[PDB]
């Protein structure tokens, strides 16, 4: 059983060390908080939160960093290396990379203005990486609501609240033009833009992502508060201003009878959203963890101990 007090005796200053690292990095990279939260998400959706995503290539297994959902997208790995080294200095061979990344995600959310809470701890590090599993398990922006639900259920998150609350992670961070080109110019081979995208916002997005333009150009997930962790993400959905297909479907999908009330509830109250987000985050952080003597306490998050 994971517990928030896991390192209260062995490394009481772990959370503080993680926080300081992120505070320092935010000065040169204001996007790092969002990037770190996403790393935790992609870690947990593949064999659980076991730091498998942090592993680099080996001749026996491929890195998850080359998965369609991570390649030329996932970032912040050097920052994780930095806090790991700092934590190793303060508490040698004590904090797992899996736990470190979980704390980093929570601290990132709080630093961005989100809720503050103590995450359950006690996770251990994987002995291998899972590229095929990452390609199969990570959801894509073009997923329909049924597919999004399937993706979450596949890893153990059955609740629509899990999906709606965790999608709130898009209240900050960036998204490449490549992922919305269809919504802007030819959605579902209709030759027309996605009808669920607000027409005024459509114009703005087309200006940022012209046809045949730079597909790697970055756009803000939340047009209201691009870098602040708040409930504005849901207010956007209510106005048909969700950026990617998977965002807007939470409010507009024919299958959204169960998610619409959640979107509204989170848009109506910051407290309701924050509570639901913490609840969902801890549930996601509880996905098939290695505990006790299973796995290791990786010293270098990029490689298995030898
Ligand atoms: C529900 C399905 C989801 C899909 C299909 C999805 C898809 C995406 C895509 C397409 C990007 C843009 C990547 C890029 O352009 O490089 C992204 C970024 C991001 N996602 Fe999601 N996401 C989902 C759920 C989540 C969840 C559950 C969280 C965390 C609680 C999360 C947090 C983020 C953050 C913070 C970013 C910004 C990262 C950065 O700017 O570096 N996402 N997501
Ligand atoms: Ca993992
Ligand atoms: Ca925001």
Catalytic residue among 19, 38, 40, 42: 42
43 is in an annotated binding site: yes
**Four-point Cα dihedral 74, 80, 81, 87, nearest 10:** -170
User: Is domain 139-284 annotated with CATH 1.10.420.10?
Assistant: yes
Residue whose C-alpha is closest to residue 267's, from 221, 228, 236: 236
Signed CA dihedral, 16, 21, 25, 27: sign only: positive
User: Cα–Cα distance between 255 and 282 in angstroms, integer?
Assistant: 26
282 is in an annotated binding site: no
User: Cα–Cα distance between 171 and 225 in angstroms, integer?
Assistant: 7
Joined together, the tokens standing for residue 279 give 């609840």
Class of domain 2-138+285-305: mainly alpha
Q: Is the distance from CB of 299 to CB of 87 less than 8 angstroms?
A: no
Q: Relative to the CA of 179, which ligand 1 atom is closest?
A: 10
The DSSP code for 3 is: B
Name the method of structure determination: X-ray
182 is in an annotated binding site: no
Resolution of the entry in angstroms: 1.6
Reply yes or no on whether 42 is catalytic.
Answer: yes
Q: Quick one: angle between helices 77-90 and 14-28, nearest 10?
A: 150
User: Cα–Cα distance between 169 and 165 in angstroms, integer?
Assistant: 8
Does the beta carbon of 244 sit less than 6 angstroms from any atom of ligand 1? yes
Q: Is the distance from CB of 233 to CB of 176 less than 8 angstroms?
A: no
Alpha-carbon Rg for the chain, nearest whole angstrom, is 19
171 is in an annotated binding site: yes
Q: Relative to the CA of 139, which ligand 1 atom is closest?
A: 5
Q: How far is the CA of 218 from the centre of ligand 1 (A)?
A: 13
Q: How far is the CA of 12 from the centre of ligand 1 (A)?
A: 31
Domain ranges of the chain: 2-138+285-305, 139-284
Residues with CB under 5 A from ligand 3 (ion): 171, 222, 225, 228, 230, 232
Per-position DSSP letters for 204-223, written without gaps between them: HHHHHS-TTS-TT-EEES-S
Residue whose CA lies nearest to ligand 1 atom number 13:
175
Cβ neighbours of residue 55 closer than 8 Å, sequence gap 6 or more: 61, 63, 64, 126, 128, 129, 301, 302, 303, 304
Residue whose CA lies nearest to ligand 1 atom number 8:
141
Q: How far is the CA of 176 from the centre of ligand 1 (A)?
A: 11
Joined together, the tokens standing for residue 23 give 């505070």
Does the beta carbon of 176 sit less than 6 angstroms from any atom of ligand 1? yes
Q: How far is the CA of 77 from the centre of ligand 3 (A)?
A: 23
Which residue(s) pair with 220 in the sheet?
174
Size of the chain in residues: 306
Residue whose CA lies nearest to ligand 1 atom number 2:
139
């Amino acid at each position: 059983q994971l517990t928030p007090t896991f390192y209260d005796n062995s490394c009481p200053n772990v959370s503080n060390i993680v926080r300081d690292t992120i505070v320092n990095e935010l000065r040169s990279d204001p996007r790092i908080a969002a990037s770190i939260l996403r790393l935790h998400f992609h870690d947990c959706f593949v064999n659980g939160c076991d730091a498998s995503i942090l592993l680099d290539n080996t001749t026996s297994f491929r890195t998850e960093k080359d998965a369609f959902g991570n390649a030329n997208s996932a970032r912040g790995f050097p920052v994780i290396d930095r806090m790991k080294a700092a934590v190793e200095s303060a508490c040698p061979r004590t904090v797992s990379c899996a736990d470190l990344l979980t704390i980093a995600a929570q601290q990132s959310v709080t630093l961005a203005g989100g809720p503050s809470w103590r995450v359950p701890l006690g996770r251990r590090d994987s002995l291998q990486a899972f590229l095929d599993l990452a390609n199969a398990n990570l959801p894509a922006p073009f997923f329909t609501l049924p597919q999004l639900k399937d993706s979450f259920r596949n890893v153990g998150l059955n609740r629509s609240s899990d999906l709606v609350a965790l999608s709130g992670g898009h209240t900050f961070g960036k998204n490449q033009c490549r992922f919305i080109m269809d919504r802007l110019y030819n959605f579902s081979n209709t030759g027309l833009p996605d009808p669920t995208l607000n027409t005024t916002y459509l114009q703005t997005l087309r200006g940022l992502c012209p046809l045949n333009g730079n597909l790697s150009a970055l756009v803000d997930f939340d047009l209201r508060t691009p870098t602040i962790f708040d409930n504005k993400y849901y207010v956007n959905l209510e106005e048909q201003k969700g950026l990617i297909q998977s965002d807007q479907e939470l409010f507009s999908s024919p299958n959204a009878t169960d998610t619409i009330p959640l979107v509204r509830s989170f848009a109506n109250s910051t407290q309701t959203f924050f509570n639901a987000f913490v609840e969902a985050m801890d549930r996601m952080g509880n996905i098939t963890p290695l505990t006790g003597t299973q796995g290791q306490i990786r010293l270098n998050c990029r490689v298995v101990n030898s």
